[PDB]
Curated annotation (Swiss-Prot), chains A, B:
Full-protein residues shown: 1 to 38 of 352
Entry-listed glycosylation sites: 11, 18
Additional remark text: Plerixafor (AMD3100), an antagonist of CXCR4 activity, blocks HIV-1 entry, interaction with CXCL12 and subsequent CXCR4 signaling.
Protein name: C-X-C chemokine receptor type 4
Disease with which this protein is associated in UniProt: WHIM syndrome 1: An autosomal dominant immunologic disease characterized by neutropenia, hypogammaglobulinemia and extensive human papillomavirus (HPV) infection. Despite the peripheral neutropenia, bone marrow aspirates from affected individuals contain abundant mature myeloid cells, a condition termed myelokathexis.
Source organism (scientific name): Homo sapiens
Functional summary from the UniProt entry: Receptor for the C-X-C chemokine CXCL12/SDF-1 that transduces a signal by increasing intracellular calcium ion levels and enhancing MAPK1/MAPK3 activation. Involved in the AKT signaling cascade. Plays a role in regulation of cell migration, e.g. during wound healing. Acts as a receptor for extracellular ubiquitin; leading to enhanced intracellular calcium ions and reduced cellular cAMP levels. Binds bacterial lipopolysaccharide (LPS) et mediates LPS-induced inflammatory response, including TNF secretion by monocytes. Involved in hematopoiesis and in cardiac ventricular septum formation.
Impact after mutating residue 12 to F: Sulfate incorporation greatly reduced. Moderate reduction in sulfate incorporation. No sulfate incorporation and binding SDF-1alpha greatly reduced
Lineage, opening ranks: Eukaryota, Metazoa, Chordata, Craniata, Vertebrata
Curated annotation (Swiss-Prot), chains C, D:
Chain residue ranges for the region called Receptor and heparin binding: 8-12
Disulfide-bonded cysteines: 9-34, 11-50
The protein, known as: SDF-1-alpha(3-67)
Interval of the full protein contained in this chain: 22 to 89 of 93
Effect of residue 43 to E: Loss of integrin activation
Amino acid sequence: MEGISIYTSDNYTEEMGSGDYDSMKEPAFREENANFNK
Amino acid sequence: MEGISIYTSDNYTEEMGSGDYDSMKEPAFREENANFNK
Amino acid sequence: KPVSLSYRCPCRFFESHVARANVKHLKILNTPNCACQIVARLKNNNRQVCIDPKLKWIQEYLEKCLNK
Amino acid sequence: KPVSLSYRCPCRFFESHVARANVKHLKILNTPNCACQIVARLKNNNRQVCIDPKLKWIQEYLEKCLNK
């Protein structure tokens, strides 16, 4: 979370813009055996 | 080191075998503030 | 070479979930106004995809990298 | 071309304590015979170098990437 810094100069050359794949999530730092959703 | 499977065979195309920069290091999870060795 | 248009994310849409068995490798690139932009290349499926850095397998990968 | 059938790690040597001032972004590629392995693509002066993924700035970087 710490906004220390990024790379001094990425200057990112975008390869593509893309358009999503499947489900998304947030870290829970724990295993998950209780529910499945999409 | 735990995981179901890693990237299942990248077949990595060597782009520069590098040449070593300085020293080496190893993490211990527990932070190391004073690390003065080079 | 205007590669960085503005303070925008390289990937307009990100690929969440994805198959970690279908991935080549990851690239962590962080533009100064976006989350930890991780982009991973597909072995054979389409092309290179942008991965959500909040994915459980991404977390695991990051976490286990400290170990391995 | 060298194919990953035999055990070939990109780091013939690896840049440990590489300068972050010189890095644009990191490409993480865990090769079968080797630990977590990162190759960093550098700014205009250098190209790519293979990184010691045991560096404190790498570890911290991984750790913050989990959620930021």
